Design an enzyme around this catalytic site. Structure first.
Site, PDB file in Angstrom:
ATOM      1  N   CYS A   1      -8.789   7.245  21.292  1.00  0.00           N
ATOM      2  CA  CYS A   1      -7.662   6.926  22.200  1.00  0.00           C
ATOM      3  C   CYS A   1      -8.195   6.328  23.486  1.00  0.00           C
ATOM      4  O   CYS A   1      -7.851   5.199  23.872  1.00  0.00           O
ATOM      5  CB  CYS A   1      -6.753   8.162  22.449  1.00  0.00           C
TER       6      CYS A   1
ATOM      7  N   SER B   1      10.867  -4.079   1.273  1.00  0.00           N
ATOM      8  CA  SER B   1      11.347  -4.081   2.672  1.00  0.00           C
ATOM      9  C   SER B   1      11.589  -5.475   3.279  1.00  0.00           C
ATOM     10  O   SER B   1      10.794  -6.370   3.066  1.00  0.00           O
ATOM     11  CB  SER B   1      10.347  -3.329   3.563  1.00  0.00           C
TER      12      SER B   1
ATOM     13  N   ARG C   1       3.099   9.116  -6.132  1.00  0.00           N
ATOM     14  CA  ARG C   1       4.300   8.842  -5.390  1.00  0.00           C
ATOM     15  C   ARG C   1       4.776   7.444  -5.598  1.00  0.00           C
ATOM     16  O   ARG C   1       5.962   7.194  -5.452  1.00  0.00           O
ATOM     17  CB  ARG C   1       4.016   9.052  -3.914  1.00  0.00           C
TER      18      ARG C   1
ATOM     19  N   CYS D   1       1.697   8.083  19.751  1.00  0.00           N
ATOM     20  CA  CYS D   1       0.288   7.870  19.325  1.00  0.00           C
ATOM     21  C   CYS D   1       0.189   7.560  17.809  1.00  0.00           C
ATOM     22  O   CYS D   1      -0.743   6.914  17.367  1.00  0.00           O
ATOM     23  CB  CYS D   1      -0.585   9.090  19.687  1.00  0.00           C
TER      24      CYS D   1
ATOM     25  N   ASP E   1      11.757 -12.132  27.143  1.00  0.00           N
ATOM     26  CA  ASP E   1      11.817 -11.662  28.514  1.00  0.00           C
ATOM     27  C   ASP E   1      10.716 -10.605  28.786  1.00  0.00           C
ATOM     28  O   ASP E   1      10.136 -10.564  29.849  1.00  0.00           O
ATOM     29  CB  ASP E   1      13.219 -11.161  28.767  1.00  0.00           C
TER      30      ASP E   1
ATOM     31  N   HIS F   1      14.236  -1.608  28.030  1.00  0.00           N
ATOM     32  CA  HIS F   1      14.434  -2.935  28.489  1.00  0.00           C
ATOM     33  C   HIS F   1      15.877  -3.248  28.412  1.00  0.00           C
ATOM     34  O   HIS F   1      16.500  -2.993  27.405  1.00  0.00           O
ATOM     35  CB  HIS F   1      13.585  -3.921  27.711  1.00  0.00           C
TER      36      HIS F   1
HETATM   37  C1  HEM Z   1       3.133  11.413  12.729  1.00  0.00           C
HETATM   38  C2  HEM Z   1       4.382  11.281  12.282  1.00  0.00           C
HETATM   39  C3  HEM Z   1       4.736  10.320  11.132  1.00  0.00           C
HETATM   40  C4  HEM Z   1       4.480  10.518   9.837  1.00  0.00           C
HETATM   41  C5  HEM Z   1       3.756  11.734   9.236  1.00  0.00           C
HETATM   42  C6  HEM Z   1       4.967   9.384   9.083  1.00  0.00           C
HETATM   43  C7  HEM Z   1       4.882   9.223   7.714  1.00  0.00           C
HETATM   44  C8  HEM Z   1       5.568   8.313   6.936  1.00  0.00           C
HETATM   45  C9  HEM Z   1       5.417   8.153   5.500  1.00  0.00           C
HETATM   46  C10 HEM Z   1       4.463   8.977   4.605  1.00  0.00           C
HETATM   47  C11 HEM Z   1       6.238   7.169   5.093  1.00  0.00           C
HETATM   48  C12 HEM Z   1       6.397   6.662   3.639  1.00  0.00           C
HETATM   49  C13 HEM Z   1       7.829   6.879   3.163  1.00  0.00           C
HETATM   50  C14 HEM Z   1       7.924   8.215   2.482  1.00  0.00           C
HETATM   51  O1  HEM Z   1       6.899   8.648   1.896  1.00  0.00           O
HETATM   52  O2  HEM Z   1       9.019   8.847   2.527  1.00  0.00           O
HETATM   53  C15 HEM Z   1       6.939   6.669   6.260  1.00  0.00           C
HETATM   54  C16 HEM Z   1       7.890   5.675   6.284  1.00  0.00           C
HETATM   55  C17 HEM Z   1       8.437   5.118   7.417  1.00  0.00           C
HETATM   56  N1  HEM Z   1       8.238   5.549   8.739  1.00  0.00           N
HETATM   57 FE1  HEM Z   1       6.959   7.152   9.319  1.00  0.00          FE
HETATM   58  N2  HEM Z   1       5.549   8.519   9.991  1.00  0.00           N
HETATM   59  C18 HEM Z   1       5.415   9.048  11.262  1.00  0.00           C
HETATM   60  C19 HEM Z   1       5.878   8.454  12.420  1.00  0.00           C
HETATM   61  C20 HEM Z   1       6.850   7.476  12.450  1.00  0.00           C
HETATM   62  C21 HEM Z   1       7.637   7.121  13.599  1.00  0.00           C
HETATM   63  C22 HEM Z   1       7.517   7.763  15.000  1.00  0.00           C
HETATM   64  C23 HEM Z   1       8.472   6.136  13.272  1.00  0.00           C
HETATM   65  C24 HEM Z   1       9.461   5.548  14.303  1.00  0.00           C
HETATM   66  C25 HEM Z   1      10.154   4.437  14.077  1.00  0.00           C
HETATM   67  C26 HEM Z   1       8.264   5.815  11.862  1.00  0.00           C
HETATM   68  C27 HEM Z   1       8.929   4.882  11.061  1.00  0.00           C
HETATM   69  C28 HEM Z   1       8.919   4.754   9.665  1.00  0.00           C
HETATM   70  C29 HEM Z   1       9.635   3.748   8.894  1.00  0.00           C
HETATM   71  C30 HEM Z   1      10.539   2.625   9.426  1.00  0.00           C
HETATM   72  C31 HEM Z   1       9.319   3.973   7.410  1.00  0.00           C
HETATM   73  C32 HEM Z   1       9.838   3.120   6.210  1.00  0.00           C
HETATM   74  C33 HEM Z   1       9.042   1.805   6.117  1.00  0.00           C
HETATM   75  C34 HEM Z   1       9.559   0.735   5.166  1.00  0.00           C
HETATM   76  O3  HEM Z   1      10.770   0.453   5.004  1.00  0.00           O
HETATM   77  O4  HEM Z   1       8.710   0.075   4.532  1.00  0.00           O
HETATM   78  N3  HEM Z   1       7.270   6.671  11.404  1.00  0.00           N
HETATM   79  N4  HEM Z   1       6.524   7.396   7.359  1.00  0.00           N
HETATM   80  S1  FES Z   2      -3.263  11.571  20.614  1.00  0.00           S
HETATM   81 FE1  FES Z   2      -2.244  10.618  22.374  1.00  0.00          FE
HETATM   82  S2  FES Z   2      -3.799   9.651  23.642  1.00  0.00           S
HETATM   83 FE2  FES Z   2      -4.796  10.485  21.766  1.00  0.00          FE
END
Ligand code: HEM
Ligand code: FES
Ligand code: HEM
Ligand code: FES
Lengths: 359, 359
Positions: A347, A66, A51, A132, A319, A166
């Protein structure tokens, strides 16, 4: 003059340079608290190989990396300056960046913190809304750091583990939305729909009991009241890597949805994140706002500027930290409850790390 | 005196007797607005005639009927008693009940409202959090009426289509939560977990952009806000009929799951309904609070009282109508926007019935 209060700012992170993409993809496909156990263990290494190049090309189209660290340091320097004035009893403040999948890691931040001899450390997640997968994983990495090294902390620990409402965060989101609304043609404004978009989560994480989508929903409602419901809106969700069912609607099928329905002026709002990244600069701006929106016949699709350097966001960080100090709280009362269907022995240990130290 | 303002209270309803059960399931099942399980139609009377006596048994377990109509009449009345005094210019107010699936049906109350020669008619969903399957279905029945009968309404129409965070609504809940709290053994009060419980939705509807789950979460945020986050909480989802995937966690599953992880002090709050009914009286009190409960080794499980005859709740409904009147709004801003994946052609014309009416 020596630091007393250290503020640990947590976010998963992002590869600063093209070269970094690889271990970022590795540390992340290894992280248990984020994803499923498919004989991974050493299955991640293969995936990171395949990837990397593809993801790399993605980071190429946005300046080659980034901007999170830039933004985070900016936000933190502002926060620290305000706090040295607003809270002189804790008077010398210092921030520390602690990324979960890139350098400087959570693990490297805590080691610099212990070395500085702090009176106090606070784990301030930069995810306003709790998952989580997100805040949970960073907080676990703290308990485990001190598990690995085998010694209690030499400083009092606390966490600001969530903050979906907030008021200053809400003022920031609402200001950035009014000013984007301002660029729609004056005759296209009132019909603009506001599409709130957050990173999705697998239904397996949702059905576990994960608090995130309820909290994100709380941010949205709170921004809309402050906007006096000026425009209609919907909360939708971006991403959905994999075969698995994720919570929807997806942001992509929503844009195409609205267009096919005579709704062609859409204002996208990144509501779960506090700065720019591949999700906002690639996934949303390029890709949904250029490639897909062109194929759909959108008349105008705008994206609310991320908070990034908004000084009012620094004021929000400060704040939070100050209210957190004055209240002498250890964590939110929500952190004292685990998900009803949690299958993760760590956890409960992370929680005990914050609730039951000695200070 | 002659009624001048009419408040059409909309609810799905439920069978007031065992005799009414089969009629209720028929219409319930004949409702494309509610489900597209009319995959093949006349498969509805098939399931009606089928399950009628099972359901009849459920109702016997709680008095022989749903109390929905008694509680709605009493609410309707305090409401009218308040509106006369507080909004005298809108003369005598009168309440009409519009159940979706039982008498009085929405069509029956309209035909009376039409006959009563009112100045104004207000469609006042009795669901705080809007969903296309509840309020949307019920609004569509009004628009279908007029179409069917082939004439323009003889009276001016508007709708209060949602109210998920109204301040008096929130106070009722926080008050009921608080009084149920006091009834737990004292030294356990602070370990009680608050489980807010709403009817679930098929993933197929959520994923289409139903607004309900977002609004429900807003209602929970406000309640806990007024409670100062005094106990930890989760928002879960109950009922759920069939084999396709619905929105979880599930109440039962989460109750169970909590008890096995040590959390055996639980308070249920039915957060998406204002009245006791089958889901509260049978599904919660029995099956969750007894069978499955004492069976998991629950220490204490209570349920906050339904809004029912709270005098503060009638004040909430009159307060919403009064403000509605002074607002001159025809419908919420939300209503003016269909789900981004809306496929129900009725939705659009129901919008225009409230926005673009010819009186
Ligand atoms: C359990 C669920 C989640 C999975 C499986 C996951 C997985 C991933 C993976 C594999 C990537 C790499 C980019 C790609 O391969 O397309 C990524 C990127 C990203 N994820 Fe998630 N993530 C999760 C939860 C979250 C949550 C809740 C947020 C909320 C803000 C988040 C924010 C981001 C951001 C901002 C990036 C891009 C990072 C960068 O610009 O370097 N992720 N995520
Ligand atoms: S998965 Fe939420 S407290 Fe463990
Ligand atoms: C489109 C999604 C929905 C479907 C398919 C659905 C289906 C059903 C069915 C079949 C029943 C009868 C259960 C039985 O016969 O034992 C029922 C009960 C009920 N539903 Fe839903 N429902 C949906 C959404 C909702 C929502 C969002 C609410 C409100 C929050 C709601 C409120 C109720 C109530 C109050 C009952 C009790 C029925 C009774 O009193 O007998 N429904 N639902
Ligand atoms: S299904 Fe929601 S607008 Fe039609």
């Amino acid at each position: 003059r020596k630091p007393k209060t250290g503020i640990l700012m947590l976010n998963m992170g992002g590869p600063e340079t093209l070269g970094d993409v690889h271990d970022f993809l590795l540390r992340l496909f290894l992280d248990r608290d984020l994803m499923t156990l498919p004989i991974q263990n050493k299955l991640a290494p293969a995936i990171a190989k395949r990837r990397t190049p593809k993801i790399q090309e993605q980071y190429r189209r946005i300046g080659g990396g980034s901007p999170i660290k830039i933004w985070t340091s900016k936000q933190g320097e502002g926060m620290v300056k305000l706090l040295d004035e607003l809270s002189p009893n804790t008077a010398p403040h210092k921030y520390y960046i602690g990324f979960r999948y890139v350098h400087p890691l959570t693990e490297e931040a805590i080691e610099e913190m212990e070395r500085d001899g702090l009176e106090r450390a606070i784990a301030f997640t930069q995810y306003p809304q709790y998952s989580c997968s997100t805040t949970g994983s960073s907080l676990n990495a703290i308990y485990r750091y001190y598990n690995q090294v085998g010694r209690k902390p030499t400083m009092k620990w606390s966490t600001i583990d969530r903050w979906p409402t907030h008021h200053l965060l809400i003022q920031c989101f609402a200001d950035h939305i009014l000013k984007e609304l301002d660029h729609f043609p004056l005759e296209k404004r009132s019909e603009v729909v506001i599409l709130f978009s957050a990173h999705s989560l697998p239904m397996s994480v949702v059905n576990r009991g994960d608090p995130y989508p309820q909290e994100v929903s709380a941010t949205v409602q709170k921004v809309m009241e402050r906007l006096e419901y000026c425009n209609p809106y919907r909360l939708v969700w971006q991403s959905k890597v994999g075969p698995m069912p994720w919570l929807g609607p997806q942001t992509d099928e929503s844009i195409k949805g609205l267009c096919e329905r005579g709704r062609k002026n859409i204002l996208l709002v990144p509501i779960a994140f506090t700065s720019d990244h591949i999700d906002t600069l690639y996934e949303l701006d390029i890709e949904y706002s250029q490639v897909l929106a062109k194929e759909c016949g959108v008349e105008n699709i705008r994206r609310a500027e991320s908070l990034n350097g908004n000084p009012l966001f620094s004021k929000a960080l400060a704040d939070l930290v100050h209210s957190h100090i004055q209240s002498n709280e250890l964590c939110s009362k929500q952190l004292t409850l685990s998900c009803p269907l949690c299958v993760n022995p760590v956890c409960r240990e992370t929680k005990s790390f914050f609730t039951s130290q000695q200070l």
